[PDB]
Design an enzyme around this catalytic site. Structure first.
Site, PDB file in Angstrom:
ATOM      1  N   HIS A   1       0.813  -1.210   0.000  1.00 36.50           N
ATOM      2  CA  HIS A   1       0.000   0.000   0.000  1.00 36.50           C
ATOM      3  C   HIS A   1       0.849   1.263   0.000  1.00 36.50           C
ATOM      4  O   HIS A   1       0.358   2.320  -0.410  1.00 36.50           O
ATOM      5  CB  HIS A   1      -0.962   0.042   1.200  1.00 36.50           C
TER       6      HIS A   1
ATOM      7  N   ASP B   1      -0.500  -7.949   1.951  1.00 39.37           N
ATOM      8  CA  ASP B   1      -0.085  -6.578   1.646  1.00 39.37           C
ATOM      9  C   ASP B   1       1.355  -6.373   2.135  1.00 39.37           C
ATOM     10  O   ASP B   1       1.649  -5.605   3.054  1.00 39.37           O
ATOM     11  CB  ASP B   1      -1.116  -5.592   2.242  1.00 39.37           C
TER      12      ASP B   1
ATOM     13  N   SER C   1       3.620   3.106   9.068  1.00 39.92           N
ATOM     14  CA  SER C   1       3.305   1.858   8.392  1.00 39.92           C
ATOM     15  C   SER C   1       4.570   1.031   8.209  1.00 39.92           C
ATOM     16  O   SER C   1       5.660   1.578   8.008  1.00 39.92           O
ATOM     17  CB  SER C   1       2.645   2.119   7.035  1.00 39.92           C
TER      18      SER C   1
END
Lengths: 155, 50, 158, 158
Positions: free
Chosen positions: D35, D57, D109
């Site tokens: 992402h 992901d 992240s």
């Protein structure tokens, strides 16, 4: 300081719970921003509808009072106060630091150093270090200008 | 007299041309009234804030 | 003095070798000359495309990240006064700059000239000798903001 | 505590002057988010090709520098316990992951969370909110050691 001047003057707008904006009674005119919607408090204002202007993202009207913040057609640059912090007028821009703002900061008024309202903020720019703000101001002839901070993000 | 003469000659053509004329002038007047009202709003929305 | 004013505030241009001058992000636009080019240091700010203007010897673009950061607001009035910059002081004597003879070299072009309060009045591009003290080919403004390439005599760019 | 454990282990993924998170090495292979991606710095471990995995992901590859260098052991079990992390401690709410509200956001992240023994237990991806505590998107393991991607409610990936 500013809270005492804005006491019973800045009216929160209930978005089914929390607040989205503040309405400002100035100069015998009510004031409220279009881009954020909700339920205004103090139902003497809720009973009256407010005629619109989408180009300024705002809507105005009259006041049912038996509330009269003055107008400033001239604002020296200096620095002014608002109830989250200090602001400076830099040849066409109003300036706040990094973390101050957030969604729901629209409709807040900015006063002068002693009490007269000079403008009302509706958003800001995405940058910081005393960055520009989406503000509605008045010129030397008392004409409304929506100052564009090239932000397009209404905090 | 022109209206009744053309209605007697060609009924449907005369009624549709006067219907079109009436509709055109009504839409024109309504559109120009809306344009004048919108121009008035955009002109006097600054000055009503003082 | 001026070191605090220009600390992490202006960047250097590069000919893939030794240092050769500076480019200053001023008023939201980069101030980068024509005569020296090749590499903006801190390539984060080199991704901007700089449209040219040879009439004032400038390549300028739009600064990314924070535009208000590293602002360098201009000035309009120009009293004679006393002006500060990287190696020292210049006097604005009857429309010209007087500046000590020893300063210069390739690498001088890129220095913004600052006032006492910390606003730019000119950005150094060139030089010219007048015996005891030298003179500079520079870009200045006026009372209404019009930009003039201030070059009083035959001046070599640095 | 966790600062010592994650020192020179969380290599910055990078875009255009902004650090948008980090990338972490576990078990002799390199994590990299799908992402959010870009340039891995310290290019001695960036030239490898990272084969993608959209079901979790992530992207995974191999370590090029030597046989081991930087690695983090997993934990097969997940006690409620006490788990340190870069911006504070995270907790196991009997199947729910709560982290304090003030910490999080963009640039958080692809980060690890560590147990009291010093081993990684989960991989930080995103975030949601349920008041004082917030719930984060995460990649974890189970009792058999099969990885599972947890995205509680409308979690916003960082």
């Amino acid at each position: 300081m500013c809270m005492k001047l804005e006491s019973d003057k800045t009216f929160p707008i209930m978005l089914n719970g929390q607040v989205n904006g503040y309405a400002c009674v100035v100069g015998g005119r009510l004031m409220k921003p279009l881009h954020v919607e909700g339920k205004i408090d103090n139902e003497q204002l809720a009973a009256v509808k407010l005629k619109k202007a989408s180009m300024y993202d705002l809507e105005y009207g009259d006041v049912p009072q038996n509330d009269t913040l003055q107008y400033t057609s001239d604002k020296p640059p200096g620095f002014y106060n608002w109830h989250h912090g200090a602001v400076q007028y830099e040849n066409g821009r109003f300036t706040v630091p990094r973390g101050v703002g957030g969604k729901g900061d629209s409709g807040r008024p900015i006063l002068d150093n002693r009490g007269r309202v000079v403008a009302i903020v509706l958003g800001g720019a995405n940058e910081g270090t005393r960055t520009a703000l989406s503000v509605v101001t008045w010129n030397q002839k008392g004409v409304t200008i929506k100052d564009t901070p090239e932000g397009s993000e209404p905090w | 007299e022109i209206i009744i003469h053309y209605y007697h000659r060609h009924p449907v053509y005369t009624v549709i041309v006067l219907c079109g004329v009436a509709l055109a002038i009504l839409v024109g007047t309504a559109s120009s009234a809306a344009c004048i009202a919108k121009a008035r709003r955009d002109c006097l929305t600054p000055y009503a804030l003082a």
